[PDB]
Design a protein around this ligand. Structure first.
Ligand SMILES: [Zn+2]
Ligand SMILES: [Zn+2]
Ligand SMILES: [Zn+2]
Ligand SMILES: [Zn+2]
Length: 110
C-alpha cells in the first residue's frame, strides 16, 4: 500500500523515466506517488507540495470552504501550491477562465 513508486514510469524516487533521482509526491489519501516531471509539476510545486499534504486529481479539494461534490470537480488547481479552489471560492472572485497559470488566494493575497 505505502509502496513509494511512480504511477507513470513505475519508478521510485531514486529513479525517474530517465534513471534520474528525484523525490516522489505521494497522495495524502491514496498514497500514490509520482515524480514532478512525470506529473508535469512546476519547480515551485515540487518544493511547495513536498512540504504540504498533497492530494491527487481524484482527492484534490477546496481550501477556502473545504467541500466536495459536483462543484469540487470544477475547482481550479493552484500552479504554486496545487491547492484546489472552487471557481466562486477564488479570492478575489473568478471572472473567467484565465488562459495560462492559475494561483490561489493563499499564494497571491488581495
Ligand atoms: Zn515517474
Ligand atoms: Zn488520492
Ligand atoms: Zn470552496
Ligand atoms: Zn496556492
Amino acid at each position: 500500500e505505502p509502496i513509494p513508486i511512480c504511477s507513470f514510469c513505475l519508478g521510485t524516487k531514486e529513479q525517474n523515466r530517465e534513471k534520474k533521482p528525484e523525490e516522489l509526491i505521494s497522495c495524502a489519501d491514496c498514497g500514490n506517488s509520482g515524480h514532478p516531471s512525470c506529473l508535469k509539476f512546476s519547480p515551485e510545486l515540487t518544493v511547495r507540495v513536498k512540504a504540504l499534504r498533497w492530494q491527487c486529481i481524484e482527492c484534490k479539494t477546496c481550501s477556502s470552504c473545504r467541500d466536495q461534490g459536483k462543484n469540487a470537480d470544477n475547482m481550479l488547481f493552484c500552479d504554486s501550491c496545487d491547492r484546489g479552489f472552487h471557481m466562486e471560492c477564488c479570492d478575489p472572485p473568478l471572472t473567467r477562465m484565465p488562459k495560462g497559470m492559475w494561483i490561489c488566494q493563499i499564494c497571491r493575497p488581495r
